[PDB]
Amino acid sequence: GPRTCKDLLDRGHFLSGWHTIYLPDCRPLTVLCDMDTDGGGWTVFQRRVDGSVDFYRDWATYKQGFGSRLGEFWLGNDNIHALTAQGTSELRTDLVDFEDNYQFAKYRSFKVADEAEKYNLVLGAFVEGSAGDSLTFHNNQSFSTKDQDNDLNTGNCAVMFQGAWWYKNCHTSNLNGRYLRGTHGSFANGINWKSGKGYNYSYKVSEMKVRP
Amino acid sequence: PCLTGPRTCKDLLDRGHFLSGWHTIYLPDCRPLTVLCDMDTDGGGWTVFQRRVDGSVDFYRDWATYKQGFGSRLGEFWLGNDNIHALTAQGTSELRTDLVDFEDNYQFAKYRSFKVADEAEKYNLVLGAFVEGSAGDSLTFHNNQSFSTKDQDNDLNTGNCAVMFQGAWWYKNCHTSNLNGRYLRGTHGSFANGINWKSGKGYNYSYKVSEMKVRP
Amino acid sequence: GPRTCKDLLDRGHFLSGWHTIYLPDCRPLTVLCDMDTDGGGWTVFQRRVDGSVDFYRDWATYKQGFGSRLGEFWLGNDNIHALTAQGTSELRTDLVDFEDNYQFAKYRSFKVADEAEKYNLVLGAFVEGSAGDSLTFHNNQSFSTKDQDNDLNTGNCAVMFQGAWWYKNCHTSNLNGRYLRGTHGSFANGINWKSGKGYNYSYKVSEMKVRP
Numbered sequence: 001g002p003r004t005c006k007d008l009l010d011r012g013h014f015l016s017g018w019h020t021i022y023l024p025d026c027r028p029l030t031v032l033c034d035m036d037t038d039g040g041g042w043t044v045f046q047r048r049v050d051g052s053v054d055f056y057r058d059w060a061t062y063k064q065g066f067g068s069r070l071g072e073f074w075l076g077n078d079n080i081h082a083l084t085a086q087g088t089s090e091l092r093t094d095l096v097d098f099e100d101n102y103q104f105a106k107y108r109s110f111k112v113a114d115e116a117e118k119y120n121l122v123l124g125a126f127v128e129g130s131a132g133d134s135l136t137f138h139n140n141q142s143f144s145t146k147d148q149d150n151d152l153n154t155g156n157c158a159v160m161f162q163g164a165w166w167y168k169n170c171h172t173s174n175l176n177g178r179y180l181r182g183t184h185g186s187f188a189n190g191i192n193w194k195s196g197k198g199y200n201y202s203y204k205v206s207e208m209k210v211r212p
Numbered sequence: 213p214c215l216t217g218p219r220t221c222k223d224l225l226d227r228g229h230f231l232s233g234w235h236t237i238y239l240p241d242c243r244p245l246t247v248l249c250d251m252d253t254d255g256g257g258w259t260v261f262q263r264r265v266d267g268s269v270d271f272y273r274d275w276a277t278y279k280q281g282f283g284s285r286l287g288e289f290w291l292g293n294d295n296i297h298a299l300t301a302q303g304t305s306e307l308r309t310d311l312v313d314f315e316d317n318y319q320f321a322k323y324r325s326f327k328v329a330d331e332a333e334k335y336n337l338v339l340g341a342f343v344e345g346s347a348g349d350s351l352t353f354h355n356n357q358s359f360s361t362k363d364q365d366n367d368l369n370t371g372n373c374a375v376m377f378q379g380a381w382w383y384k385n386c387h388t389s390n391l392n393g394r395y396l397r398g399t400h401g402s403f404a405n406g407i408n409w410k411s412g413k414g415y416n417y418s419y420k421v422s423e424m425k426v427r428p
Numbered sequence: 429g430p431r432t433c434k435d436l437l438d439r440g441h442f443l444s445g446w447h448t449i450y451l452p453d454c455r456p457l458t459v460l461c462d463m464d465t466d467g468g469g470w471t472v473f474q475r476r477v478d479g480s481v482d483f484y485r486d487w488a489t490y491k492q493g494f495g496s497r498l499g500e501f502w503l504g505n506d507n508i509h510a511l512t513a514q515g516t517s518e519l520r521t522d523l524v525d526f527e528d529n530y531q532f533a534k535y536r537s538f539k540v541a542d543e544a545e546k547y548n549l550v551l552g553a554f555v556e557g558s559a560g561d562s563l564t565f566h567n568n569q570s571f572s573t574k575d576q577d578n579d580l581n582t583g584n585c586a587v588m589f590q591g592a593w594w595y596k597n598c599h600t601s602n603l604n605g606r607y608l609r610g611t612h613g614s615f616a617n618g619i620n621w622k623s624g625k626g627y628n629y630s631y632k633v634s635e636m637k638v639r640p
């Protein structure tokens with residue numbers, strides 16, 4: 001049984017799409033495989049495309065995943081942990097702006113600790129990216145939702161920034177923020193990536209994906 | 213195979229399928245049917261039987277086409293009146309209607325029960341009370357009406373509602389909702405012939421997104 | 429087991445979508461069925477819809493197929509060969525312009541040969557269609573890509589018209605050309621069908637599909 005989207009590609013599945021893979025415990029998970037980008041074989045765990053799905057959600061909803069296979073989704077923190085748990089996988093963030101310019105950022109390794117240990121981002125070196133590095137900042141940080149104050153801020157970033165992320169004090173990227181659609185008067189609260197288009201530009205497309 | 217598998221989108225949710233998407237369920241006669249589950253809205257577990265999203269599919273269709281279903285799992289579809297009957301025949305599924313306008317305003321309507329009868333009763337709508345909903349109630353008017361299409365007029369109008377309003381629905385004389393009407397993209401001059409919900413955006417506004425869905 | 433999209437239709441699958449069929453040799457293949465158009469039961473091997481996928485690809489990429497089940501794709505020349513080898517598939521070509529006007533072309537028989545014959549086009553008579561006939565000109569020609577020029581031009585048709593096709597000298601259709609979005613000054617390098625909207629109009633939607 002295929003472990004990853006990479007295995008599916010090696011088995012001759014050349015079209016991107018939803019396929020079932022088997023996580024280490026042999027639980028089946030239907031995941032979105034990107035078989036085109038950068039050699040293919042990526043498992044996509046976040047996708048924003050059109051603002052049809054609310055990403056301003058609570059801890060339990062980020063834990064189990066939400067959205068739709070027909071568009072936007074977060075795969076879920078438990079699933080992302082299970083996917084990235086033993087061994088390691090490249091993280092790749094793909095971004096597409098309103099003018100259709102591609103930026104990306106690729107980290108050597110990526111995982112998140114299980115719910116007992118919050119979803120602490122354990123993340124390797126930045127390898128390369130036109131987006132620049134905007135995650136290492138958040139390394140060794142719990143994930144935080146509006147109703148879960150694991151952030152070290154005097155107040156609540158998730159509420160301040162209308163999303164969820166490994167918030168510290170507070171964020172340099174915010175890809176699960178509001179779908180504001182370009183540049184946006186308010187501060188730090190869209191699909192932002194600081195080193196990319198900054199704290200006042202919300203991307204059109206966001207995808208976070210993993211590969212062995 | 214049938215006896216092990218899910219019988220509704222609600223069972224799939226309870227088994228840990230948290231993403232909306234197409235999954236195969238087993239009807240009461242054990243027929244497998246691939247249906248769209250909404251796991252994301254109002255607690256999830258809804259089986260979606262109508263979906264409009266971009267006007268790519270013609271909804272101005274005949275009786276036999278509505279009977280069997282048409283459209284695409286990629287986008288827009290009507291699941292089919294025989295399937296909707298089989299999904300709702302045995303007890304109590306509630307109905308949710310989700311509508312999005314071109315300005316990203318989300319409105320909905322929720323009904324306590326919804327059942328459509330078989331082909332022999334012309335898919336008669338059996339509709340429970342309006343629970344709540346920011347779209348207002350534009351379906352109680354249509355309670356106990358036959359389903360009608362352009363080529364089969366079962367309405368209470370002396371004419372042809374399906375033709376007049378370029379749709380297929382449980383028309384009375386004629387309508388207050390028309391979610392299988394034409395994809396007119398927002399404001400239209402033509403009367404009552406779009407994806408309309410009277411109490412919502414009125415007879416001259418065709419929604420961007422329409423979804424009709426059911427749950428136990 | 430279903431052998432074609434037509435068998436699926438006859439078994440009561442009335443919604444278009446991706447289903448797995450069994451090729452002549454019993455290899456499973458997940459294919460897009462069009463269950464609506466012209467009686468339904470078509471297996472779609474090419475789809476353009478929005479320009480999200482690059483069709484300017486090499487020989488090996490066209491051989492194995494590329495793109496996405498959520499959108500645009502080429503099914504792959506080996507698969508198209510395997511689908512069309514055993515007998516008589518009709519071909520239907522569906523085109524939509526930017527004013528949502530539909531045109532089509534239908535051919536009696538269509539097959540492509542194997543890799544050794546360079547996926548040669550074997551095309552039966554034109555039956556009808558509002559787009560007119562812009563494929564018979566290409567009868568009995570090898571498929572060409574940028575990196576494998578099997579065309580009748582002193583140069584490279586695939587490069588000159590940014591596509592992949594059964595080019596002669598050079599073309600009257602170019603449905604794997606660039607997604608130029610309606611009328612374009614540039615000559616013959618879009619999703620073009622000469623008898624349809626001409627050498628300077630690139631369709632919004634193109635689909636190529638087959639049925640027994």
Ligand SMILES: *[C@@H]1O[C@H](CO[C@@H]2O[C@@H](C)[C@@H](O)[C@@H](O)[C@@H]2O)[C@@H](O[C@@H]2O[C@H](CO)[C@@H](O[C@H]3O[C@H](CO)[C@@H](O)[C@H](O)[C@@H]3O)[C@H](O)[C@H]2NC(C)=O)[C@H](O)[C@H]1NC(C)=O
Binds near residue numbers: 366
């Ligand atoms: C559904 O509507 C029925 C009438 O509509 C028709 O039947 C549909 C299923 C559909 O085929 C439609 O297009 C048809 O036109 C209602 O039936 C009527 O119900 C009436 C009572 O509400 C009944 O009346 C009577 O009232 C008293 C009873 O003591 C008598 O004095 C009188 O003689 C009548 O008997 C009427 O006769 C009946 N009509 C018909 C043609 O059957 C039906 O009740 C309604 N159902 C619900 C749940 O509202």
Ligand SMILES: *[C@@H]1O[C@H](CO)[C@@H](O)[C@H](O)[C@H]1NC(C)=O
Binds near residue numbers: 568
């Ligand atoms: C096709 O072209 C070949 C050479 O490429 C030639 O031998 C042949 O006669 C043609 N065949 C048919 C059936 O038209």
Ligand SMILES: C[N+](C)(C)CCOP(=O)(O)O
Binds near residue numbers: 484485486487489
């Ligand atoms: C992936 N690529 C850069 C190495 C080879 C080219 O493939 P294609 O993109 O030309 O079809």
Ligand SMILES: [Ca+2]
Binds near residue numbers: 150152
């Ligand atoms: Ca705090």
Ligand SMILES: [Ca+2]
Binds near residue numbers: 367368369370372373
């Ligand atoms: Ca009438």
Ligand SMILES: [Ca+2]
Binds near residue numbers: 575576
């Ligand atoms: Ca070469």
Ligand SMILES: [Ca+2]
Binds near residue numbers: 577578583
């Ligand atoms: Ca040449």
